[PDB]
Symmetry: C2
């Protein structure tokens, strides 16, 4: 019923005193999507890589599904586990880097929206939670070592 496409989210950000930016299983993926076979679109779909949806007439499962029309075709997204997926590190400072891949069947990822469940470790090893990058920028201060920690000009693309 589909051609399956593999789709990558790439990010780039300028790093100050950050060892890695990353996310966990709780991370909330947010996209605007489109039907790969029609003009239909859906904004702000939300899902996690742990979500388990059983696909009809298949033994497989999906993290996100949609039945675009009254006809009996189901369209799916699955997060693809790759090793060191979902991590951006000091060494990648200001360079584009593959962040996460998805198998999409019947669906095109149009727009990605970073959420606010990122995690940051700084170079002194302390962790920051609920890191909000929906506005593409974030900083905090390490009081222990009196150190600014920042993520600037967050850029991304979905291809």
């Amino acid at each position: 019923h589909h051609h399956m496409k593999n789709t990558v989210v790439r990010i780039k950000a300028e790093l100050e005193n950050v060892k890695r930016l990353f996310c966990d299983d709780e991370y909330l993926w947010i996209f605007n999507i489109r039907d790969s076979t029609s003009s239909l679109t859906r904004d702000n779909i939300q899902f996690r890589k742990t979500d388990i949806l059983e696909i009809p007439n298949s033994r497989g499962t999906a993290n996100f599904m949609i039945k675009w029309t009254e006809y009996p075709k189901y369209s799916t997204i699955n997060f693809v586990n790759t090793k060191n997926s979902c991590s951006y590190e000091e060494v990648n400072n200001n360079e584009w880097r593959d962040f996460a891949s998805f198998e999409c069947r019947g669906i095109e990822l149009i727009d990605f929206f970073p959420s606010n469940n990122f995690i940051v470790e700084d170079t002194k090893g302390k962790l920051y939670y609920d890191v909000n990058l929906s506005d593409q920028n974030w900083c905090d201060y390490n009081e222990e070592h009196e150190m600014c920690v920042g993520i600037y000009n967050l850029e991304y693309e979905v291809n």
Copy 2:
């Protein structure tokens, strides 16, 4: 705390029961229980497993309505004879399915096309499409017309 309930009513011809199974696609328009925000045409099955933060429980549907760290949920609730509408209650309103909703109000229901019917002679019909509120088919062996007409429905 109360369940939200989808009720239906139809005219049956030679139908033992109208029912649905695990694969049935629940379709709703919904609203934030605390704001004017809405979401149309959400879709789930009763078997969907989404992990709810701050609980061991899972949900069949969830949504984060705003950037405030708080998730709202729908879960199918099993109840007596749920998801089955029978000959004995022909042309009557009956509770068809129940839903535990947290942070979400169900506003509109949309019957889908994967209902099942058992006719009064034992025959089963799959992929029964009532999204347009009427369905019929025919039992050849027994030469009888089988149908569901003027389906009506509500959720609250």
